[PDB]
Symmetry: D2
Subunit: 364 residues, 4 copies
């Protein structure tokens, strides 16, 4: 552990890992501190949908940022594999957003004018996916709302960062950021470090740092429970999505299934009632899943903010300190654009003012 770094990142989920990579790529001398292991919390619980078209209700700067991040994934697998040897496991089948009523149909068809979406009738859906529930009314097909394996996107980013000279410290929680002197310094149980810039990317745990730095921004966990099964018997290429729940086919032959929403629960392991509810929902979407062998079950904590949008930007009173936290159901999707925007700010490059405004820290 060196005494001085140009940039220090606090937290090693997908968000901090991406930021470290983009900083290292700009030749900033960078360190990352993670309390546990890289990718070991909410990042490991995520399905991995690049779900930009759960964001086009409202068609605003948040949708625009989401589509930009989706485009950034285009060459990303190759770029990171060349440096890390780690495959992000991209699956380009796309998504059927299912309807189970005429009310569902009217809501989904509001997206018809987007070039990125096409409406499929009940019969057109079943020709492509014969095992989708016969109670559907049709589905919006979203070709580019693909998926990746999030733990491996995170490991790819961090290994690439390391090969570009970033210094990674697992099992090293950050206790304090100060703030006082002409440089920031951070305190850890194994010594102290100075930095020209500090980035807080500690997910749902980020509130301690806002408060330490004179800011009241808070986070509420919304727990989500999931399971996986082996699909050894039927074809399924597209992701199936309904009412924030999903069945995602991975290239291992597993299906990933979720999820509950349990506000205010900080526990990271699933309950019996939660898993029961996940099973019940999945069966309404793909009836044949009742016969599939169960693999695993898990949970994670979504980092909920007051208004439901992330904080991505500078401390309003100190440009040396930055935050990137509060990606509720979209942190995998938004990892590259988040990483790029934070790196650009630290480098004093011009950035998109609509995104700078939308994600700013002081939203009064």
């Amino acid at each position: 552990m060196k005494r001085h770094y140009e940039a220090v990142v606090i937290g090693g989920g997908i968000i901090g890992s991406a930021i470290a990579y983009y900083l290292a790529k700009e030749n900033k001398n960078t360190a990352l501190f993670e309390s546990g292991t890289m990718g070991g919390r909410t990042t490991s619980a995520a399905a991995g949908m690049l779900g930009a078209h759960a964001e086009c209700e409202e068609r605003d700067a948040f949708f625009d940022f989401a589509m930009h991040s989706q485009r950034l994934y285009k060459g990303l697998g190759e770029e990171l594999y060349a440096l890390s040897g780690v495959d992000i496991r991209q699956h380009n089948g796309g998504m059927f957003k299912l309807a189970f009523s005429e009310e569902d149909v009217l809501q989904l068809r509001q997206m018809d004018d987007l070039d990125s979406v096409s409406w499929y009738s009940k019969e057109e859906v079943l020709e492509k996916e014969p095992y989708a529930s016969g109670d559907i009314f049709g589905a919006s097909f979203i070709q580019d709302d693909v998926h990746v394996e999030p733990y491996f996107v995170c490991k790819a980013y961090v290994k690439a960062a390391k090969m570009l000279g970033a210094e990674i410290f697992e099992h090293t929680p950050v206790l304090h950021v100060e703030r006082d002197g002409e440089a920031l310094f951070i305190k850890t149980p194994s010594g102290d470090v100075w930095a020209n810039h500090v980035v807080v990317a500690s997910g749902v745990w980020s509130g301690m740092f806002f408060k330490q730095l004179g800011l009241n921004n808070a986070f509420l966990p919304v727990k989500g429970e999931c399971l996986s099964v082996w699909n050894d018997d039927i074809p399924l290429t597209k992701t199936l999505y309904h009412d924030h729940c999903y069945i995602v086919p991975r290239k291992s032959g597993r299906l990933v299934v979720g999820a509950t929403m349990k506000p205010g629960d900080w526990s990271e392991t699933p309950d019996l009632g939660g898993l029961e509810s996940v099973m019940k929902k999945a069966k309404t979407m793909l009836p044949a899943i009742q016969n599939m062998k169960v693999d695993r079950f898990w949970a994670g904590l979504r980092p909920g903010t007051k208004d439901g949008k992330p904080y991505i930007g500078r401390h309003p009173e100190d440009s040396r300190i930055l935050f990137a936290a509060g990606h509720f159901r979209n942190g995998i999707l938004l990892a590259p654009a988040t990483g790029a925007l934070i790196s650009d700010l630290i480098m004093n490059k011009e950035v998109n003012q609509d995104w700078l405004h939308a994600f700013r820290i002081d939203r009064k």
Copy 2:
């Protein structure tokens, strides 16, 4: 591996392990052959209830054998620990057989005249176990229908048998039993061995040997799926039982919960619909289970016979061959009595004639 043994046991579940122990205690030179690892199939799936009082319909020979076997468990843990160093994990809390209707109350109170049983009102049940469902009408308390951990009963028996001289061959499937000569022989992939007596204790897989030896006795698997949770928050001492389903409190703090009944299914891991149904049923018996963290899921194959009773006895044309298989939901309970009976028969000792008839091979 020797050329000849006085007795050979085929199968290393709880039934075969018990038989080898009783035989070695009689100073029979004994070997046991098991296809995989000891206790690795149906024995590992069982809850471990000593459920004699799910067996008192017609209060007959089968009920008498069950009560005898239950009594044989009295000093067993201490006996086997002295030779093996393995604890069978006996829990003497007893069982509440619950009622959820006036029909249930009638059926259950027919046991009131037995010394083994006492009726509890709704209010008396909730005094002892406040978290039992408030929809009950009361319960029968059976003090002696206690529980053990069946994998460790199996390991205790086999290690005890080893210390007394038995030779145990894991990863050694038996392919054939030959009758034609003065003594028997068996064939394995590691070589062929002679034996004075052979005992078939291969569970639901026993059909192959019956057929090989001129008998049409057949087995149907009835698969059962179970789950466990951690009970970190409430007191629960007694087992809860209703309509062949159960919640069994272990001394680790886990609850064992089951079970489905799927006839004709030879698969040994649980599917999604089965686990969903187990969770649904458990919640009606103990509502607070909804909030408990899930630990593990599993399944096993009950060995079903034409009339639901096991075959424990000699081949009717050859007293050198014996069978001990088809213990449907009662093989943990019946392991000691089954072992003692087969060993007594090999020794040509007098045995109970009602039991010998009830479990005979030739039932037409």
Copy 3:
């Protein structure tokens, strides 16, 4: 389960799975029977090297068959993914066969005349792989001796076969093949089935079937123990190979490490002494591995034959019966060529006579 099939395959490792696929692709009505789960035995233990240049000592028909099978892998990932949705996880880094003495150098340089191999000096090796042991003398670089994840090659083959109409029966061991009538029929615990052709692909367990069919061909297990670690800190692209031991970098960031050779041991789980020896060897090849976190440990049984070559062909007295078993350290490599050769025979196509001879059943 139907009464009649055109072709029946006994065993569901990678070999039987491939054969079922090629038969289904020829529109033969096919069934496969597997005792347990698909790919669940020796196939799951394998590293997955396509190791043809461990076969060019002797430069004979076996080397030629191995190179042919390696070429068959070229478009295989894509062909199977299109039908199954399962990714075989191919890694095209290639292999350094290391030397640690001048005697090693002379032996490896015997391959220099092959276009598929280039000799690298000590310094040339370390420029590509700086963490390979500094005690090496150089290495042969074998560009096309790449690797795949064998469990997933097997799952891809079987899911593709199913989509082409093959019928797959897990948890259905075959008890007997007969032989007697104008058609073969096979016996299982859940009923009997007739077939115009039967293929034995039961790996190290295949001996029972040879013997049932009047043939004395035998198999000896050679157990191999392995482990995996997480490589989160150093670059490693090429497989490292020395004296039948190896370090294989997977695209998850894990390294796969092996292996012991324990003749006559049928146990399928690793010993303490075996794993210790694997650790010791790995450290001599890649010293930095001592600091890497351990992931998993496992074992499997290599199917050893008398002369060390597989049996791939017809029963000499009955062209309806075929065998494909005894691939010692090369069954992953040889899976496509094995599958193709068996399918071609069943279809009465002309085949390569050198390969037909080399792998024939009656090698006197």
Copy 4:
């Protein structure tokens, strides 16, 4: 969660769980806060030896406290089971401290004058334990240095505390302790709570709180790596111990084997070189272990202090604050005595002054 508690415990390992129990038994309104799950860190890594006689150098106050704590285990299993339903799994076989040189024999025989100990010759050791290494010179037999399973001691204490009224908050890290007011308060991400007394029992992570409260007491992790195997073949009743390494027979049939010593390492999973060294050492103590099937690998962080002794006592400037942390290799042994001492201090009862001095916070 209430606004105020009479006592608050920070940390839910074995030390904190014990403290909460003794406090609730005194009818103190008590809460305990734990960052993750109860017993989930160093407590889960421990073998569970009650090793008082690895503590008799200078036969001093520390040895006396160890013997007192060992005596407190006498009725503990039964006491905690009555309230919790959780078995601590005590094994009363005792310990052989082995000698492999004349130097070892001299050191060990200095304990001969204690009532707790008896010397055994080589021949007398091998009579009792035939599989101990034949290279030994004899061993000291310590009957009372028995073992328990530490995770279940922890779970028993906490569940017992709950039944007596303690309120337990998992997934609730404490960020700060404030001294300035009439009562203390603590800050958590779920809100801030007042308390009359606060006890810091956060193991190797306790340094943060010392520093927060004006004290420079520091902690260094000494990581230890262990493994387990299945002992299915030999008798082993006594624990074997040599040079801080051990083989501990559990009543499940497992052996627990350890351990390395890696100062300065905060990582909590084992590396390859560490496990290799544990296997090598175990084979010198019990050669037959080479053939045993491996079960599990793990690691944990010993909380090392400047002089190797724990801090158990009051903050020297504020009697409302207490610490109980830095139990290096003896925290399972010392849990009962540590709990009773902290509880007695909170109650203002008279305590042993030698012990109060030996473990005081201000050692300069």
